[PDB]
Design a protein around this ligand. Structure first.
Ligand SMILES: [Cl-]
Ligand SMILES: [Cl-]
Length: 162
């Protein structure tokens, strides 16, 4: 298992514009298009991202291209983030995938704000961090997914995804 597979499981794959769990227009494998309520605004950002007049539908290959770009950007965001880098550098490979998953879902800013949990992770206090990570809007709004990511940080294994 790996980051791509892991996110493909948490996000799914949809080839037509859809509303995410927060009601925002998205497409592909969790690629947010806009926080705007305007579908047209969505179609516009979509065409701009794909490079063609999509009419709100893309192919699998296109979805995958966006996904690759988004994973790359996430990793790079973590590495450029002064508060996140150190965390990531301290972790093992499985756990790094968990941290990338969170960033992909919520943005680096979002994640960097889990100050206390980040510290705990840096210190390798797995059970404590898992408990702290759970006291969040994140967990309360998308509890199944959050449980999967949390277990992954708690165990350093992919068991939640098998
Ligand atoms: Cl883009
Ligand atoms: Cl969920």
């Amino acid at each position: 298992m790996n980051i791509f597979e892991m996110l493909r499981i948490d996000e799914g794959l949809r080839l037509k514009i859809y509303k995410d769990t927060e009601g925002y227009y998205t497409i592909g494998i969790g690629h947010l298009l806009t926080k705007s309520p305007s579908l047209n605004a969505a179609k516009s950002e979509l065409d701009k991202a794909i490079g063609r007049n999509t009419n709100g539908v893309i192919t699998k290959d296109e979805a995958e291209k966006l996904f690759n770009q988004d994973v790359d950007a996430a990793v790079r965001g973590i590495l450029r983030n002064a508060k996140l880098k150190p965390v990531y550098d301290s972790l093992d490979a499985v756990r790094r995938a968990a941290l990338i998953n969170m960033v992909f879902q919520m943005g680096e800013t979002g994640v960097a704000g889990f100050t206390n949990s980040m510290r705990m992770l840096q210190q390798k206090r797995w059970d404590e961090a898992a408990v702290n990570l759970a006291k969040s809007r994140w967990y309360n709004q998308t509890p199944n997914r959050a449980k999967r990511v949390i277990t992954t940080f708690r165990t350093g294994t992919w068991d939640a995804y098998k």
